[PDB]
Design a protein around this nucleic acid. Structure first.
Ligand code: MG
Ligand code: MG
Ligand code: MG
Ligand code: MG
Ligand code: MG
Ligand code: MG
Ligand code: MG
Ligand code: MG
Ligand code: MG
Ligand code: MG
Ligand code: MG
Ligand code: MG
Ligand code: MG
Ligand code: MG
Lengths: 81, 132, 129, 99, 32, 101, 103
RNA sequence: GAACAAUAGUAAGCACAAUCAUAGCACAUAAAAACGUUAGGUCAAGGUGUAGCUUAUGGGUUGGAAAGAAAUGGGCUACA
C-alpha cells in the first residue's frame, strides 16, 4: 500500500505584518484566532486535517485565511459593547 | 543455558553455515538481518503484514524448491516490489530451475498483489564456516 | 525522452526537507553521499544534518513457562539524516526527488516536507468584502 | 469573564467549524464519536488475522498439483499409514463405541 | 550432466565502464 | 484451517463487529447524550441490547496470529512472545537486535 | 523480450504494477472528486429537522463530528444523517411524550 | 600423563579471556558463559513419538464461578 494517513495534513504560515489590516481588524483577528498566532514572530499558522485529501485541506486552509481576513474588518454591536 | 536458535558443539565433525554458527546475541554485531523492510522504524505502519508475509515466503520457498535450498532465504522489500534472494544448491537440471523461477514469480505476484523479483545464486556445496 | 512546456507558472519551494529514517548508519552515510553528489550536479544548493538517534527497547520473558526473574530485552534503533534543500523550482524538485526515491534502499524510509511559496489568495488581495 | 469574550469565542468556533452552542462535557463525546473511526472498523482490528484457510488450502492443492512439497504432512501421512497398518486406524463414524 | 562456467569477471575488460554491468538495483551477484 | 477453534470464534467476532459497526455507533450516540430526552435513551438502550452481542467490540480478543496464544502478544507484530522471540533470534525480524546498554 | 532492467521497470509502470514517482500517497484515490465544502459544511442535510429543538443540539453535534471525520466519504456521512431522519421520524410518539413538541 | 636452571606430552575445536553495546577514552554495567548436573520446568505457546476418545474425552448457545474459620509469602501506607 502507498496509503499513509499522515500525508493529509497541511500547514499555512503567514506573516501578519505583510497584511493590509486595519488597526481594529488586526487586533480583532488576534483575539479571534488565538493560539495559532505567535505574538513574538507574527506567524499565523493554520493546520488542517479534517479532509481525506491533501488538495482539500489546502482549499480549506485557504478558506480559513480568506474568512478570517473578511471577518476581522467587520465591526458589530457587541464590539461596541 | 540459552537454547535460543543455537547449534550445539558436536564431536567436532559437524558442518556449519556462517549464519547457524553465530548465536542470537550476535545480530547486528557480526551477523546481519535476514530481511529488510521499513516496518520497524520509529514512525511506521503495517510491520505485522510484512512479518506474516515474510514467514509465508520462508515456508513457500522451502516447499517449492525441495532439498535444493542452501542457506536461509534473504528477503528485501523495495518500494512495493519484493526482491527475494536465495542461496540454492545445484541438484536440479537447469530447465526445472527456470520452470520454478517463472512459477514462483507469477504465483507470488498474484498472491501478494505486488511485483516479485527472484534471484537464484547457485552454489556447489553448502558453505562451511566452522568444523568440518 | 519527451519534454513539454506548458504556459503555467511553475511552483516555487522555499525549503525542501527530506528525512531518511534507517537502521544501519552505514546505509544512511552512503545515501547521504549519493544525495549530495546528485544535488551538486543539479545545482540544487543543499545542506545535511544528523538528528538525535531514537532507541526503543522492550522486554519479554526468557522462558516458555515460568521464570519471571528472567527476561530478555530487545532493541530497535532508528537513525536519521536530513537533507535540507533551498530555493528549488517545481520541476527541479520533481526530478531530483524522483531520482532520490527511485534509488531508496530497502532498509530505509523517507519523509518529505515541502514548504511552498504562494503570494496571496485572490479574494484577500486588496478587496475588503 | 466578559460578554465580548463570549461573543469572540462563539465567533471563532463557528468560524473554524468546531462546536457552536455551549454543550456539556458529556454530550461532547458524540462529537468525538463520529469524529473518529469506530474501534471495530479499524483495519488494525477486523483484518487482524490473515485468512488461514487461504494459505492452508492453496498450499494443499499446490501439493497435489505436484508443485509444493509439504514435509510435515508427508511425515503425518507416513505415520498414519504405519498406524493403520498395525491395526489401529480411525473408526468409521458411529462404529467404534457400541461394538 | 554437471555444468561449470567461469564467471564474467574472466571476460571482463579492465577499462570496461561499470554502469553498463550494473545499471539498476541488484542482489550482488558474486559472479558478475 | 485457523490454528485453533478459539481462533474461528474470534475471526467470526471480528466479522460480526465489522458488520454491525454503524448500527452500534449510531444507536450509542443517542444513548451517550445528555441533550436528548431520557425517553429516547431507554428505547435505544433496549435497541443496542437487542443486537447480537457476539457483534459487540469488547468481546474481541487479540491473539497471536500464528500461534493463537491469548496473552503475551505484542501489539505491533500481532505475535506471541515465544513466536516473536523465535523469529527475532534467527534474525528473521528486521531491525530487532538483542538490546545491550 | 526485456532488453534491460530499466526496460523492465518501465513496462511494469506503464502496466501499473510499479508505483509512480515521486510518490504522492493519495495516488489512485480520487475521493469522488469532492471538495472541502462538501465535507465541512453540512447545512444541506439539516434542512429537514426542527430548527429550535434539542434535536438541533444533537444534530449539530453529529454535524461537527462528521465535519471532522477524514475516514469517511460524502456518501457515508450522508447515510448517517438520513438514518437519523428516518430514526427520529419513525418515533413521533416518544418525541411528543417527553415534554417537547417535535416535527 | 606436570615440574621451566623442566622429569612425556603435542593437538586445531568449543568455553573463559579478547573484541563488540552502553555513541570518543578508561573503569563500571550490560551481554556472554561450553561439557555436563538436577529423569529440574513446561504434551495448556506451538509441534510432535506412544497410547487412547469419534451420535463424543469432538463442535456450538445460555447462564454460572473466583465465597473466608483461618495459616502464611511478597508488597503499600503508616506509627508522627
Ligand atoms: Mg542467565
Ligand atoms: Mg479484552
Ligand atoms: Mg567501543
Ligand atoms: Mg569490561
Ligand atoms: Mg547476566
Ligand atoms: Mg566474554
Ligand atoms: Mg520431574
Ligand atoms: Mg522439584
Ligand atoms: Mg499437543
Ligand atoms: Mg501425533
Ligand atoms: Mg460441549
Ligand atoms: Mg460461557
Ligand atoms: Mg501473619
Ligand atoms: Mg516502606
Amino acid at each position: 500500500s502507498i496509503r499513509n494517513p499522515k500525508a493529509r495534513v497541511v500547514t499555512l504560515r503567514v506573516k501578519l505584518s505583510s497584511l493590509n489590516l486595519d488597526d481594529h481588524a488586526k487586533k480583532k483577528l488576534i483575539k479571534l484566532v488565538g493560539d495559532r498566532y505567535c505574538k513574538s514572530t507574527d506567524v499565523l499558522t493554520i493546520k488542517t486535517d479534517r479532509c481525506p485529501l491533501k488538495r482539500q485541506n489546502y482549499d480549506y486552509a485557504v478558506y480559513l485565511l480568506t474568512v478570517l481576513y473578511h471577518e476581522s474588518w467587520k465591526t458589530e454591536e457587541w464590539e461596541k459593547k | 543455558k540459552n537454547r535460543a536458535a543455537r547449534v550445539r558443539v558436536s564431536k567436532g565433525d559437524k558442518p556449519v553455515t556462517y549464519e547457524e554458527a553465530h548465536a542470537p546475541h550476535y545480530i547486528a554485531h557480526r551477523k546481519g538481518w535476514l530481511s529488510l523492510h521499513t516496518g520497524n522504524l520509529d514512525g511506521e505502519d503495517h510491520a505485522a503484514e510484512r512479518t506474516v508475509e515474510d514467514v509465508f515466503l520462508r515456508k513457500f520457498m522451502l516447499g517449492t524448491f525441495p532439498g535444493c535450498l542452501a542457506d536461509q532465504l534473504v528477503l528485501k522489500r523495495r518500494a512495493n516490489q519484493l526482491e527475494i534472494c536465495a542461496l540454492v544448491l545445484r541438484q536440479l537440471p537447469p530447465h526445472k530451475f527456470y520452470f520454478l523461477v517463472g512459477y514462483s514469480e507469477t504465483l507470488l505476484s498474484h498472491f501478494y498483489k505486488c511485483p516479485v523479483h527472484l534471484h537464484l545464486q547457485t552454489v556447489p556445496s553448502k558453505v562451511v564456516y566452522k568444523y568440518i | 525522452p519527451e519534454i513539454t512546456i506548458s504556459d503555467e507558472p511553475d511552483t516555487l519551494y522555499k525549503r525542501l526537507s527530506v528525512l531518511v529514517k534507517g537502521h544501519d548508519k552505514a546505509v544512511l552515510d552512503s545515501y547521504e553521499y549519493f544525495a549530495v553528489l546528485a544535488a551538486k550536479e543539479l545545482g540544487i544548493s543543499i545542506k545535511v544534518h544528523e538528528p538525535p538517534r531514537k532507541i526503543e527497547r522492550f522486554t519479554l520473558l526468557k522462558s516458555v513457562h515460568i521464570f519471571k526473574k528472567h527476561r530478555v530485552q530487545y532493541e530497535m534503533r532508528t537513525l536519521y539524516r536530513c537533507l535540507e534543500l533551498e530555493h528549488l523550482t517545481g520541476s527541479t524538485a520533481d526530478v531530483y526527488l524522483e531520482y532520490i526515491q527511485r534509488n531508496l534502499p530497502e532498509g530505509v524510509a523517507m519523509e518529505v516536507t515541502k514548504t511552498k511559496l504562494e503570494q496571496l489568495p485572490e479574494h484577500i488581495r486588496k478587496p475588503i468584502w | 469573564l466578559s460578554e465580548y469574550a463570549v461573543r469572540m469565542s462563539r465567533l471563532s468556533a463557528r468560524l473554524f467549524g468546531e462546536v457552536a452552542r455551549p454543550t456539556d462535557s458529556k454530550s461532547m463525546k458524540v462529537v468525538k464519536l463520529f469524529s473518529e473511526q469506530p474501534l471495530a472498523k479499524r483495519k488494525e482490528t477486523y483484518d487482524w488475522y490473515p485468512n488461514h484457510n487461504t494459505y492452508f488450502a492453496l498450499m494443499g492443492t499446490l501439493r497435489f498439483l505436484g508443485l509444493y512439497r509439504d514435509e510435515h504432512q508427508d511425515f503425518r501421512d507416513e505415520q498414519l499409514r504405519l498406524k493403520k497398518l498395525r491395526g489401529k486406524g480411525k473408526p468409521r463414524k458411529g462404529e467404534g463405541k457400541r461394538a | 550432466r554437471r555444468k561449470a562456467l567461469p564467471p564474467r569477471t574472466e571476460k571482463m575488460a579492465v577499462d570496461q565502464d561499470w554502469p553498463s554491468v550494473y545499471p539498476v538495483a541488484a542482489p550482488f551477484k558474486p559472479s558478475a | 484451517y485457523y490454528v485453533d477453534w478459539k481462533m474461528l470464534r474470534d475471526v467470526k467476532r471480528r466479522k460480526m463487529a465489522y458488520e454491525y459497526a454503524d448500527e452500534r455507533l449510531r444507536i450509542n450516540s443517542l444513548r451517550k447524550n445528555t441533550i436528548l430526552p431520557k425517553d429516547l435513551q431507554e428505547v435505544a438502550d433496549e435497541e443496542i441490547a437487542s443486537l447480537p452481542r457476539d457483534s459487540c467490540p469488547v468481546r474481541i480478543r487479540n491473539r497471536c496470529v500464528m500461534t493463537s496464544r491469548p496473552r503475551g502478544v505484542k501489539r505491533r507484530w500481532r505475535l506471541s512472545r515465544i513466536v516473536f522471540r523465535h523469529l527475532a533470534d534467527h534474525g528473521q525480524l528486521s531491525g530487532v537486535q538483542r538490546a545491550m546498554w | 523480450p526485456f532488453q534491460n532492467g530499466f526496460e523492465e521497470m518501465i513496462q511494469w509502470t506503464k502496466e501499473g504494477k510499479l508505483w509512480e514517482f515521486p510518490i504522492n500517497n493519495e495516488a489512485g484515490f480520487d475521493d469522488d472528486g469532492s471538495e472541502f465544502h462538501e465535507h465541512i459544511f453540512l447545512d444541506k442535510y439539516l434542512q429537514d429537522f426542527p430548527k429550535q429543538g434539542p434535536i438541533r443540539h444533537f444534530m449539530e453535534l453529529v454535524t461537527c463530528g462528521l465535519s471532522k471525520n477524514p475516514y469517511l466519504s460524502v456518501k457515508q456521512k450522508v447515510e448517517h444523517i438520513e438514518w437519523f431522519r428516518n430514526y427520529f421520524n419513525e418515533k413521533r410518539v416518544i418525541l411528543k411524550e417527553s415534554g417537547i413538541q417535535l416535527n
